[PDB]
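COMPLEX REQUEST
Ligand: 4WO
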Amino acid sequence: NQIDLNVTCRYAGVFHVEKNGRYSISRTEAADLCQAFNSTLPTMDQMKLALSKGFETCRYGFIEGNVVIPRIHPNAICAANHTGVYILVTSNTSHYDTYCFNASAPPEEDCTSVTDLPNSFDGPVTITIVNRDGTRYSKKGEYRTHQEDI
Ligand SMILES: COC(=O)CCN1CCc2cccc(N)c2C1
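STATUS: Structure written out below.
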């Protein structure tokens, strides 16, 4: 009963989270996951500011209202070579990564590790935060509030 959460640097408070390193988060689970980080789904405006500070990924993830990929550099295999906040238009499927927004983070790039999941609740799951530099933090808990997600 274990979940890995792979997290990025924060850019103007915005970061990316993947669950178990594969697209596997629903819209409801995404909201709950950000809540566990004392964060919210980003607005489009928040994501655009993050992009302007250096944020890009090669992964679809939820924001408020849409599923997006922030892109700075054109890459043929990431968002069909687009730059900017690329919006997913057409998909059959419902499970992606998520973005989250923490208002208390620094205003620009923060590439320090994440060392806490401050708002997880009591539960039986071993939840491990995995940073890109390999640094890990684990705790026993839960964050999913919808049964359909469990
Ligand atoms: C930003 O989305 C990605 O970089 C997907 C690739 N995964 C690769 C695996 C991994 C492991 C720990 C932390 C992070 N951020 C990642 C990112």
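REMARKS: The pocket of 4WO is lined by residues 6-8, 16, 18, 21, 57, 59, 130-132 (CB under 6 Å). The chain has one domain: 1-150.
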